[PDB]
Design an enzyme around this catalytic site. Structure first.
Site, PDB file in Angstrom:
ATOM      1  N   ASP A  28       0.826  -1.138   0.026  1.00 50.54           N
ATOM      2  CA  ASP A  28      -0.017  -0.157   0.062  1.00 50.54           C
ATOM      3  C   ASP A  28       0.874   1.296   0.072  1.00 50.54           C
ATOM      4  O   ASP A  28       1.944   1.324   0.388  1.00 50.54           O
ATOM      5  CB  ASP A  28      -0.912  -0.021   1.287  1.00 50.54           C
ATOM      6  CG  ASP A  28      -1.937   1.249   1.187  1.00 50.54           C
ATOM      7  OD1 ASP A  28      -2.448   1.238   0.167  1.00 50.54           O
ATOM      8  OD2 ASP A  28      -1.965   1.829   2.064  1.00 50.54           O
ATOM      9  N   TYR A  29       0.392   2.337  -0.456  1.00 43.77           N
ATOM     10  CA  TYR A  29       1.132   3.453  -0.414  1.00 43.77           C
ATOM     11  C   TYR A  29       0.803   4.594   0.621  1.00 43.77           C
ATOM     12  O   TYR A  29       1.458   4.679   1.655  1.00 43.77           O
ATOM     13  CB  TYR A  29       1.105   4.355  -1.736  1.00 43.77           C
ATOM     14  CG  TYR A  29       1.884   5.593  -1.456  1.00 43.77           C
ATOM     15  CD1 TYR A  29       3.368   5.671  -1.751  1.00 43.77           C
ATOM     16  CD2 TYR A  29       1.177   6.765  -1.587  1.00 43.77           C
ATOM     17  CE1 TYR A  29       4.166   6.572  -1.771  1.00 43.77           C
ATOM     18  CE2 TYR A  29       1.989   8.078  -1.688  1.00 43.77           C
ATOM     19  CZ  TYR A  29       3.576   7.839  -1.687  1.00 43.77           C
ATOM     20  OH  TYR A  29       4.467   9.097  -1.852  1.00 43.77           O
ATOM     21  N   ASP A  30      -0.315   5.226   0.569  1.00 46.05           N
ATOM     22  CA  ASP A  30      -1.050   6.230   1.617  1.00 46.05           C
ATOM     23  C   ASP A  30      -1.090   5.620   2.879  1.00 46.05           C
ATOM     24  O   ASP A  30      -1.823   4.744   3.212  1.00 46.05           O
ATOM     25  CB  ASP A  30      -2.068   6.821   1.171  1.00 46.05           C
ATOM     26  CG  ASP A  30      -2.098   7.609  -0.316  1.00 46.05           C
ATOM     27  OD1 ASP A  30      -1.202   8.840  -0.011  1.00 46.05           O
ATOM     28  OD2 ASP A  30      -2.223   7.426  -1.169  1.00 46.05           O
ATOM     29  N   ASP A 222      -3.084   0.051   5.516  1.00 48.31           N
ATOM     30  CA  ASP A 222      -3.558   0.870   6.567  1.00 48.31           C
ATOM     31  C   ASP A 222      -5.045   0.847   6.617  1.00 48.31           C
ATOM     32  O   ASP A 222      -5.641   1.460   7.878  1.00 48.31           O
ATOM     33  CB  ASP A 222      -2.841   2.077   6.781  1.00 48.31           C
ATOM     34  CG  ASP A 222      -3.418   3.145   5.469  1.00 48.31           C
ATOM     35  OD1 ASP A 222      -3.745   4.232   5.801  1.00 48.31           O
ATOM     36  OD2 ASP A 222      -3.430   2.611   4.489  1.00 48.31           O
TER      37      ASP A 222
HETATM   38  O1  LIG Z   1      -4.378   5.259  -2.008  1.00 50.26           O
HETATM   39  C1  LIG Z   1      -5.542   5.402  -1.123  1.00 50.26           C
HETATM   40  C2  LIG Z   1      -6.184   6.943  -1.110  1.00 50.26           C
HETATM   41  O2  LIG Z   1      -5.084   7.684  -0.720  1.00 50.26           O
HETATM   42  C3  LIG Z   1      -5.304   9.098  -0.676  1.00 50.26           C
HETATM   43  O3  LIG Z   1      -6.410   9.196   0.354  1.00 50.26           O
HETATM   44  C4  LIG Z   1      -5.695   9.087   1.676  1.00 50.26           C
HETATM   45  O4  LIG Z   1      -4.611   9.881   1.682  1.00 50.26           O
HETATM   46  C5  LIG Z   1      -4.818  11.264   1.747  1.00 50.26           C
HETATM   47  C6  LIG Z   1      -3.253  11.953   1.696  1.00 50.26           C
HETATM   48  O5  LIG Z   1      -2.584  11.332   2.992  1.00 50.26           O
HETATM   49  C7  LIG Z   1      -5.600  11.721   2.940  1.00 50.26           C
HETATM   50  O6  LIG Z   1      -5.855  13.047   2.786  1.00 50.26           O
HETATM   51  C8  LIG Z   1      -6.902  10.998   2.672  1.00 50.26           C
HETATM   52  O7  LIG Z   1      -7.818  11.286   3.735  1.00 50.26           O
HETATM   53  C9  LIG Z   1      -6.953   9.362   2.779  1.00 50.26           C
HETATM   54  O8  LIG Z   1      -8.013   8.698   2.401  1.00 50.26           O
HETATM   55  C10 LIG Z   1      -6.088   9.694  -2.146  1.00 50.26           C
HETATM   56  O9  LIG Z   1      -6.487  10.898  -1.810  1.00 50.26           O
HETATM   57  C11 LIG Z   1      -7.114   8.666  -2.315  1.00 50.26           C
HETATM   58  O10 LIG Z   1      -7.707   8.745  -3.616  1.00 50.26           O
HETATM   59  C12 LIG Z   1      -6.722   7.142  -2.300  1.00 50.26           C
HETATM   60  O11 LIG Z   1      -7.775   6.274  -2.713  1.00 50.26           O
HETATM   61  F1  BEF Z   2      -2.268   3.633  -1.374  1.00 47.94           F
HETATM   62 BE1  BEF Z   2      -2.963   2.508  -0.147  1.00 47.94          BE
HETATM   63  F2  BEF Z   2      -4.586   2.814  -0.839  1.00 47.94           F
HETATM   64  F3  BEF Z   2      -3.174   4.041   0.628  1.00 47.94           F
HETATM   65 MG   LIG Z   3      -3.280   3.190   2.438  1.00 48.53          MG
END
Ligand SMILES: OC[C@H]1O[C@H](O[C@H]2O[C@H](CO)[C@@H](O)[C@H](O)[C@H]2O)[C@H](O)[C@@H](O)[C@@H]1O
Ligand code: BEF
Ligand SMILES: [Mg+2]
Length: 290
Positions: A28-30, A222
């Site tokens: 996963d990234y975020d 996460d």
């Molecule tokens: O890749 C999963 C999602 O990542 C982003 O959303 C998350 O991360 C953001 C930056 O940290 C937060 O602001 C947000 O609340 C999280 O849910 C991205 O914006 C999404 O489109 C992706 O699905």
């Molecule tokens: F990029 Be994993 F969906 F946050």
């Molecule tokens: Mg994530």
């Protein structure tokens, strides 16, 4: 907490890593390789992450995939020149390490739900200051991190209800509550499918026997979308033990689904790491860095 999963056993992970020949990383990234922040555009790879990825990807025993909710543009921008696989929009797109173009796994799916979801999101956006809509190619995301916590969570809950009573009845779409978001995407594409396509596949051949299967799989995530990855790995592991496949020196098949979050986080992962910081420590450890 009360704790739901044990902390990751990093020395064991390291031992299984160095013992194994065909390693598959499923990241996963975020909120996993980089912290959660207010502005999604600011969620940029750290140098430490870049060094980890370079060292790890340089070992021909290793295959690394970034499997994200992010659209292709973001992943191409921040991960594109790195030697890693990419998957975008919670399983809608894949791009092999060698390949020049993406595969759209949802290319044949009905997309007429999008405008109905969009319309619904516009209503709740208007009733939720600080919220906004992210329209990707397939998936749609409603963000409310920047809104007041109470109203946002309140509006989110009844947006969830409405989508699930209308669009999710009329179409085969999944309505996913994510960290301060709602995401909608086709039900029959997801991160679990991606993991199946990568794991049950000759290491590490491009997309369309035990010696060719990965013998080490490390998967980190996460959020709710990532539970699809952990579940797919658990099912594959159980399939392998249902069959009487020879285990490794540790009595396992090298499968490590790991949640990023506190001990108390409910997940089907086998262990947790609190934050991206500990994720990079662990990956750094495997990498021979710090
Ligand atoms: O890749 C999963 C999602 O990542 C982003 O959303 C998350 O991360 C953001 C930056 O940290 C937060 O602001 C947000 O609340 C999280 O849910 C991205 O914006 C999404 O489109 C992706 O699905
Ligand atoms: F990029 Be994993 F969906 F946050
Ligand atoms: Mg994530």
């Amino acid at each position: 907490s009360n704790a739901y999963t044990p902390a990751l056993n990093r020395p064991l992970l390291l031992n299984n890593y160095k013992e194994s020949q065909r390693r598959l990383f499923l990241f996963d990234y975020d909120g996993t390789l980089t912290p959660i922040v207010q502005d999604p555009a600011a969620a940029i790879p750290s140098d430490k992450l870049n060094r980890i990825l370079d060292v790890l990807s340089s070992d021909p025993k290793n295959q690394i995939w970034i499997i994200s909710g992010r659209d292709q543009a973001f992943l191409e921008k921040w991960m594109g020149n790195k030697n890693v696989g990419l998957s975008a929009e919670h399983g809608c797109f894949m791009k092999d390490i060698g390949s020049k173009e993406w595969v759209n796994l949802a290319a044949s799916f009905d997309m007429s739900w999008q405008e109905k979801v969009d319309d619904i999101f516009k209503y709740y956006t208007e009733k939720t200051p600080g919220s906004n809509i992210e329209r990707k190619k397939v998936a749609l995301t409603w963000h409310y991190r920047r809104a007041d916590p109470d109203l946002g969570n309140f509006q989110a809950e009844k947006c969830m209800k409405e989508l699930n009573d209308t669009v999710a009845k009329e179409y085969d779409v999944e309505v996913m509550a994510g960290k301060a978001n709602i995401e909608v995407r086709p039900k029959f594409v997801n991160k679990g499918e991606i993991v199946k396509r990568l794991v049950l596949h000759p290491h590490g051949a491009k997309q369309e026997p035990i010696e060719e299967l990965p013998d080490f799989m490390l998967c980190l995530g996460d959020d709710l979308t990532d539970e699809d990855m952990f579940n797919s790995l658990n099912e594959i592991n159980k399939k392998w033990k249902g069959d009487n496949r020879p285990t490794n020196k540790f009595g396992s098949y090298g499968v490590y689904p790991v949640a990023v979050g506190p001990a108390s986080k409910k997940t089907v992962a086998i262990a947790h790491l609190n934050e991206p910081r500990q994720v990079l420590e662990t990956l750094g450890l495997l990498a021979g860095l710090v």
